[PDB]
Ligand SMILES: Nc1ncnc2c1ncn2[C@@H]1O[C@H](CSCC[C@H](N)C(=O)O)[C@@H](O)[C@H]1O
């Protein structure tokens with residue numbers, strides 16, 4: 035292992051807290067608080083302390099996508115839509131740091147207040163789930179100041195990290211990036227997924243990667259297929275674990 | 285920063301848990317449980333979760349000693365006597381890993397049971413302190429299995445980590461190492477300090493480093509000066525923080 039490989043390996047173990055192995059919140063299918071290795075490996079629990087919930091397999095995928103973009107010269111920035119405590123974006127900034135990339139930015143997009151209240155404008159699948167009801171139960175609302183604090187703890191808060199605070203329907207249409215190499219979608223709902231596919235995906239470079247964290251959620255999957263059908267996109271959907279998928283844009 | 289620099293910086297922040305900032309035990313001079321940056325920076329608190337209590341200044345010192353030994357070709361292994369949860373030894377193994385050193389071992393020596401019960405044979409200053417009284421209060425007893433588990437969480441449990449379980453009086457005289465480049469002493473008491481100086485210091489290479497973690501403790505300091513006087517050692521004692529010192533062997 036090289037210095038770069040050791041750093042990024044440790045960074046994944048740290049943002050997912052394989053190091054200290056924090057308890058999970060009890061919610062959904064998780065009925066016990068105990069840390070379970072298999073659950074954290076595949077991002078299936080609700081960490082009380084860890085900076086990301088996506089798990090090792092999805093962290094490895096993020097690494098693969100960013101490294102492939104760098105290797106193949108795919109132009110553009112990295113955007114995550116739905117960041118919680120910021121761990122996946124911290125890792126993305128770390129990847130760029132490890133390779134001394136100074137001309138790409140990590141865009142950190144969130145409401146910074148959890149899921150929105152449902153209204154009559156919402157998709158029926160989103161309204162039925164009503165993910166807003168779980169905001170407190172899994173400690174979802176996390177302020178911009180707290181996320182910035184978290185970046186600083188790893189020594190990774192700098193001018194190649196830019197924040198996009200607000201609802202995706204407000205922030206995405208005129209977000210000030212020109213091109214993306216990796217677009218990581220992690221907002222759970224039909225609405226959040228469709229917001230970002232509509233308004234950010236057209237800026238994803240050929241050869242860039244589109245990651246859908248929440249493909250196991252029917253509402254998210256619905257938006258993915260509606261959007262792909264609308265635009266005639268047939269790029270192979272590849273599974274990462276039991277929840278997430280990605281495709282590479284041809 | 286290079287990959288090695290990034291890895292070692294993160295490893296120090298992780299073993300001391302500047303990342304998640306765990307509470308301290310309320311013991312000694314510490315009257316509040318809250319994480320205090322300045323206390324963790326100088327290793328002055330009693331972490332509830334972190335893998336080392338030595339703090340950032342003493343971690344930096346250990347890095348300096350190991351890197352200097354490597355740079356100057358000082359032969360030998362690294363030994364820590366008194367390891368608690370193993371974080372300082374984990375860091376030492378990480379330094380060797382970062383520089384792809386394959387021919388040096390980190391020796392991890394502890395009772396794995398905390399401080400010993402005081403007997404009539406103990407030095408009077410050790411009987412007066414009775415450090416055994418504090419074992420449970422700061423969660424000191426940490427089994428060999430737990431320490432091995434901790435190494436494995438960082439991906440650093442391999443055949444270049446060797447364990448010496450037992451009281452130093454019993455393990456040091458015939459410990460199987462031949463030469464040391466760094467001898468890190470962290471047992472607090474006159475007895476632990478004298479046992480290790482007596483039985484391990486003669487194997488410290490010229491140009492090697494002797495670190496005394498607990499030099500602020502009068503009983504420890506007495507052993508240090510008694511030993512140095514007996515052996516005619518006049519190498520400069522260099523202060524690290526409010527607790528620790530080191531010298532480099534002529
Ligand atoms: N319509 C919307 N606009 C902006 N943010 C939203 C949103 N719907 C949900 N979110 C945010 O989406 C996130 C879902 S959880 C994200 C997990 C994170 N990627 C990790 O690494 O663990 C939450 O932070 C929530 O506040």
Ligand SMILES: Nc1ncnc2c1ncn2[C@@H]1O[C@H](CSCC[C@H](N)C(=O)O)[C@@H](O)[C@H]1O
Nearest residue numbers: 336337366367368372394395398451452470
């Ligand atoms: N005589 C003796 N023999 C063996 N181990 C001893 C000892 N006296 C104390 N110890 C051990 O010395 C350690 C003191 S605390 C060590 C702190 C550790 N270096 C860190 O990085 O935080 C304890 O783990 C205790 O079990």
Ligand SMILES: [Mg+2]
Nearest residue numbers: 220222247248
């Ligand atoms: Mg998700």
Ligand SMILES: [Mg+2]
Nearest residue numbers: 470472497498
């Ligand atoms: Mg000590």
